[PDB]
Amino acid sequence: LWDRYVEWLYQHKQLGLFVDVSRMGFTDDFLLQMEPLMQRAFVAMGELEKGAIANPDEGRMVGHYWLRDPGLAPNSFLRTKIEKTVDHILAFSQDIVSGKIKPPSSQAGRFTQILSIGIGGSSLGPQFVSEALAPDNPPLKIRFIDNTDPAGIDHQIAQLGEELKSTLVIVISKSGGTPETRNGLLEVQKAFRDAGLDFSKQGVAITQENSLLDNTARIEGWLDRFPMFDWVGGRTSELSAVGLLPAALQGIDVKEMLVGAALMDEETRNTVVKENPAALLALSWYWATDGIGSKDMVVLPYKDSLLLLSRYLQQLVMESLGKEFDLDGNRVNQGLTVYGNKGSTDQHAYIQQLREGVHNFFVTFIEVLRDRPPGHDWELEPGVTCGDYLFGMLQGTRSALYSNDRESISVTVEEVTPRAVGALVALYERAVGIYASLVNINAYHQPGVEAGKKAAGEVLALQKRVLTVLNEASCKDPAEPLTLEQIADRCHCPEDIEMIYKIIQHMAANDRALI
Amino acid sequence: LWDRYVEWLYQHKQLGLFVDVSRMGFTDDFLLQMEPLMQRAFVAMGELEKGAIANPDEGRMVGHYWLRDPGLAPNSFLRTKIEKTVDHILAFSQDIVSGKIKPPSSQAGRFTQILSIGIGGSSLGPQFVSEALAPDNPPLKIRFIDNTDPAGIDHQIAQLGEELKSTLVIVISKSGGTPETRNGLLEVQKAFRDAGLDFSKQGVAITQENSLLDNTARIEGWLDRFPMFDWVGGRTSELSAVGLLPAALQGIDVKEMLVGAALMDEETRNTVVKENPAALLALSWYWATDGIGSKDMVVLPYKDSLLLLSRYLQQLVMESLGKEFDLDGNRVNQGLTVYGNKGSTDQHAYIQQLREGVHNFFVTFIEVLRDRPPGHDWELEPGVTCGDYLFGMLQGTRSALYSNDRESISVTVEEVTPRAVGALVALYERAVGIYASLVNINAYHQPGVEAGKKAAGEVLALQKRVLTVLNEASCKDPAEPLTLEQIADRCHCPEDIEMIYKIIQHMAANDRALI
């Protein structure tokens, strides 16, 4: 196992990032069998960066690698557009932090809080970087609205209290038609009117050009607007204005994030697989799951700051790879389940099943060598610090798992830095893209979310027919009570009886119907 | 499907809790065949409540059901100690909230912050209950130290800033020998001594009587001590002093929490399976996983206050059920993987794979009827409030998943109240215990977690042996650089060379070695 660890250890000189796959049991012939498919993945990825249509389903380019390397963008209108947005974010961020741009009237004078409204990649990304890289007492605290739950938004407004007068609200949506994001903005604007505050003088929009949210922010005259591009999927939009602006608004060096991702993309373009860390991750995923997602990917970061990494990877991996149809139309239910929280906390949670329970998984440890800010280290016992225990739990768990034939990958960074986090985002973005080529699927469209989108619209459409059929009882002289079968036939939706029951069950609990 | 929904719906009138397993496709042959196994679980559960040795592997009693009904304790001493603790918690929390028990000197004159130091069930429970029931502006805000990460502990201390003078530190450990909890206590005491504070006048211990931590807090004179009993496992300790104290310290009605838990356990004793809601969950789990955990349980609560439900359920399910051996010595690698976050946020994360990807899962929806505090409900567009979208998202996902043969369970509460959370906790405790009887495993011991703790001790003992070899080589006047092979040989363990490399790598990054 020592000879295997030395033969396969990947080390990156500059970033201080390491990839260990020795605890993956891939065989000799498996490497030769996967060599032709890996070459096809590198050529397909090479034409993706050149500007080819790598998302045939939506007819769009896939250029989230240009966000960190503007030169690789194909035309001049794109290289300068990407560069002017980074400078635009840096200029506007430093104006908010230094207090040059103020709210109209607040106690602190400057902005001190951030209310980012967004869902999917518009929040999972920014939540991950914020918890990973923000200072303890940052220039601006941050809160998130990532749902359409009324109680959650009310709770955020109540805790915000009187600092709403110093809150900079950020609305992140490509079109402004996302039901959750629009609901959030509508609820917050209602709260700004109840406090007698002009939302426009405290609002920022991150949106695609000439969209419903861009027009609203332009017409209502919000503070600023930041562009989103259609070749940047929300799944891989962390290094765009989606993540760069909120991160820079908390004193985070986002330029170093772009640099770390840039150095990472150079290593992933290597055609020798053993020296390609994105290929090594994709190989191990392929080996552990037999290429059909037979096992789950358990992400175990042994750092409190990386707690939100796994649910960030839940979108990047499961939504990119959970495709029903192969690129040639054949029914192939691909995917790669991801879960996990944090070490060593998860050892007192579900490692009982991981070690001796059902073997339906493989682990990916994320290790961070530096333990604490410099000048805070001290020994708890002779020769051992508080951080040495954290190091020991990971190594003992890695050892206790492999001893029972449970495989694992180890990814190691020296310190959780803007540069390293940007490298980790770039690493998994390419590894997902390479893996989709191995299983022959399009990683950049989202066909599976459409079915829930229509079924949810039909429920809201059914609710209005229920109210329409009911207001007969409210306003017709043959005032009478309708049975469930009677609401259904008059709605001309008889087979929807069950949904009608759940609809009136919800309205009765919110003082909108009587039973 | 409507007829199946009407036939199988379970309502618990007093609690307002519903269970819908109509979208589980178990046949009548399944119900007929599982009836002998189900009745055996009801008898075993009765013997467990009466005081039998339910944890056979450790020779202990399982009595978390006595925490909510002290009358059914096997003796009057156990009944007395349970009720004296609840009275003790209430009187101490009321005196903390009202300010009758003060910090030695603070700006507010009252305790304002809670620092809960605990691991596993000592934190997951209090974290879940806090986010679900704490008021918007509680009498005391709460923070959790649940790891041995020094950066995270220093982070919480830095954010706490000056309010450390008015922080109530709670230390939760059974014997006080848990390494994570011990290191967190040492780090907090260092911060208290650096600020000139005395930890004894702001510290509370939740421990087993006459343990190392119980004797220390009694001799050093901490604020107060609360018992932790040996017949209560970590993952079923939420309604004991572990969860009741941090909850009551935030103004949460812990009495109603016990009421709902007791009300729930009365129904989960019903012998009729169709009206035993713990049996309805256990059967649906057994069906979807075919008894051997071949499908994950995705938990999607559609409410922000229930975000930490799956992390709590991850411990209760995957640590009770992931057992390698049957109760008869047979090797069955049981298990039931659990993950999930919240709706509708997870719709834009991995419902893509849930809808059309790998069919290796089943969903459990948690629906809440009351979507908003009274007086806050308003209509975004004509005839639809913000909660109608939340409700439509859940029904749309449940429908879109079932169309593609993805089965699901629906749990409905009227509102996330103290009584509802206690009942929902008690529902899953009994369902897990019942499921363990079906697969003939012991759900109350943790044999699989020791191999990581033991291997973690071997690494630290190796580090101290490595440090002895390095310090000998560094205290020669002709200083002596050593290689990995040399270090492993002077430690007289050449096979451990891989662990020595990681020890030196982690030490070099913390300025404790040079390369």
PDB file of N, CA, C and O in Angstrom, chain B residues 102 140 193 247 256 302 372:
ATOM      1  N   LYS B 102     -26.745  35.416  37.221  1.00  0.00           N
ATOM      2  CA  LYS B 102     -26.012  36.374  36.412  1.00  0.00           C
ATOM      3  C   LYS B 102     -24.600  35.889  36.124  1.00  0.00           C
ATOM      4  O   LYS B 102     -24.058  35.050  36.850  1.00  0.00           O
ATOM      5  N   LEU B 140     -31.572  33.933  24.694  1.00  0.00           N
ATOM      6  CA  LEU B 140     -30.147  33.670  24.548  1.00  0.00           C
ATOM      7  C   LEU B 140     -29.902  33.047  23.182  1.00  0.00           C
ATOM      8  O   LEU B 140     -30.553  32.061  22.825  1.00  0.00           O
ATOM      9  N   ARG B 193      -9.687  32.144  30.118  1.00  0.00           N
ATOM     10  CA  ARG B 193      -8.577  32.625  30.933  1.00  0.00           C
ATOM     11  C   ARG B 193      -7.828  33.763  30.246  1.00  0.00           C
ATOM     12  O   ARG B 193      -7.232  34.607  30.923  1.00  0.00           O
ATOM     13  N   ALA B 247     -32.588  23.666  24.859  1.00  0.00           N
ATOM     14  CA  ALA B 247     -33.848  24.157  24.309  1.00  0.00           C
ATOM     15  C   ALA B 247     -34.540  25.098  25.287  1.00  0.00           C
ATOM     16  O   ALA B 247     -34.923  26.216  24.923  1.00  0.00           O
ATOM     17  N   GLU B 256     -44.193  20.892  26.475  1.00  0.00           N
ATOM     18  CA  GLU B 256     -45.004  20.466  25.342  1.00  0.00           C
ATOM     19  C   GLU B 256     -44.250  19.491  24.453  1.00  0.00           C
ATOM     20  O   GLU B 256     -44.864  18.636  23.804  1.00  0.00           O
ATOM     21  N   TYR B 302     -40.207  20.368   3.673  1.00  0.00           N
ATOM     22  CA  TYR B 302     -40.457  21.595   2.912  1.00  0.00           C
ATOM     23  C   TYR B 302     -40.734  22.770   3.849  1.00  0.00           C
ATOM     24  O   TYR B 302     -41.796  23.391   3.840  1.00  0.00           O
ATOM     25  N   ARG B 372     -47.045  30.302   7.884  1.00  0.00           N
ATOM     26  CA  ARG B 372     -46.699  31.667   8.231  1.00  0.00           C
ATOM     27  C   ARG B 372     -47.249  31.999   9.605  1.00  0.00           C
ATOM     28  O   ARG B 372     -48.338  31.517   9.951  1.00  0.00           O
TER      29      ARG B 372
END
